[PDB]
């Protein structure tokens, strides 16, 4: 399980793609020893902890060890001005932004396919007993149209209410099954094409709203089937919610007959459903 330590000047920034709660992403370039290769790389400087500890080095290593089809591998770390996580640059950027910008050229197939992928993405984390804590359409990236990866897993081991399960809002109890809740929302985010969860509603009302039995609404292109999946992810009781295994199997079952479960109009015709 090999982590790369990268020099402060083996790393050169171009621009800023986005700053969140934790740090700031930079599009960057990386020149390993010599003058032969130049990657396209993505740089994550965290601004406050976390300092160059063995404790730090331990958690980095774990993260370096994280390895999927559908998970973003940490490539390297620099320490020199402060802590910097180095990631292969995803040219298409984040899925959230992606489903908005191509709203009209994204078929059913991809949509369910992304589902599966993130599902399997999480399976692994679950199998490795890592709890992401912060799954949303933003922190899923797009390597290629048919290929998405998850990022930002375990970032709180180093260092989002509308994607939080209820038990994490009250009792900050962070579990795989609390991530499940997140997934629910993430996929919802896709079906709507990038819709904003609980739109035009304040933060501090979310919890009581949920407790009432009000959840996120049915997306336009959704058959009740796939919606019932979602619903199950926002079950008050944690254990009652699905395991990533299941959610995979299900969306994977659905990607065999794609338009059987999601209906998308335009093309001058009106697709009609049954049963």
Curated annotation (Swiss-Prot):
The organism's superkingdom is given as: Eukaryota
Q: Which effect does the record note for changing residue 101 to K?
A: No effect on kinase activity
Give the consequence of mutating residue 155 to R: Strongly reduced autophosphorylation
Describe the effect of residue 14 to I: No effect on kinase activity
Where in or outside the cell it occurs: the entry states: Nucleus; Mitochondrion
Residues in a coiled coil are: none
Q: Where is the active site?
A: 134 (proton acceptor)
What's the impact of mutating residue 145 to Q?
A: No effect on kinase activity
Reported impact of residue 73 to Q = No effect on kinase activity
The entry's stated outcome for residue 204 to Q is: In ALS19; reduces autophosphorylation upon NRG1 stimulation
State where ATP binds. Answer: 17-25, 44, 88-90, 134-139
According to the entry, every stretch annotated as the Protein kinase domain falls at 11-262
Result of changing residue 57 to R: Strongly reduced autophosphorylation
- State the protein's name: ERBB4 intracellular domain
Q: Which organism is it from?
A: Homo sapiens (Human)
Q: Please spell out the taxonomic lineage of the organism that makes this protein.
A: Eukaryota, Metazoa, Chordata, Craniata, Vertebrata
């Amino acid at each position: 399980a090999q982590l790369r330590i990268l020099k402060e000047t083996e790393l050169k920034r171009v621009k800023v793609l986005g700053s969140g709660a934790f740090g700031t992403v930079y599009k960057g370039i990386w020149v390993p020893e010599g003058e032969t290769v130049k990657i396209p790389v993505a740089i994550k400087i965290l601004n406050e902890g976390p300092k160059a500890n063995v404790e730090f080095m331990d958690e980095a290593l774990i993260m370096a060890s994280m390895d999927h089809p559908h998970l973003v591998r940490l490539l390297g770390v620099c320490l020199s001005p402060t802590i910097q996580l180095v990631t292969q640059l995803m040219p298409h950027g984040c899925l959230l932004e992606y489903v908005h910008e191509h709203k009209d050229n994204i078929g059913s197939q991809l949509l369910l396919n992304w589902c599966v992928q993130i599902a399997k993405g999480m399976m692994y984390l679950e199998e490795r007993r890592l709890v992401h804590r912060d799954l949303a359409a933003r922190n899923v990236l797009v390597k290629s149209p048919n290929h998405v990866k998850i990022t930002d897993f375990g970032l709180a081991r180093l260092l989002p209410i509308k994607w939080m399960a209820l038990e994490c809002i009250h009792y900050r109890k962070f579990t795989h099954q609390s991530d499940v809740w997140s997934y629910g929302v993430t996929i919802w985010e896709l079906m709507t094409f990038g819709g904003k969860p609980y739109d035009g509603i304040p933060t501090r009302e979310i919890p009581d709203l949920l407790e009432k039995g009000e959840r996120l609404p049915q997306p336009p292109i959704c058959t009740i089937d796939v919606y019932m999946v979602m619903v199950k992810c926002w079950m008050i009781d944690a254990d009652s919610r699905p395991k990533f295994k299941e959610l995979a199997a299900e969306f994977s079952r659905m990607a065999r007959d794609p338009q059987r479960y999601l209906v998308i109009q335009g093309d001058d015709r009106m697709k009609l459903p049954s049963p």
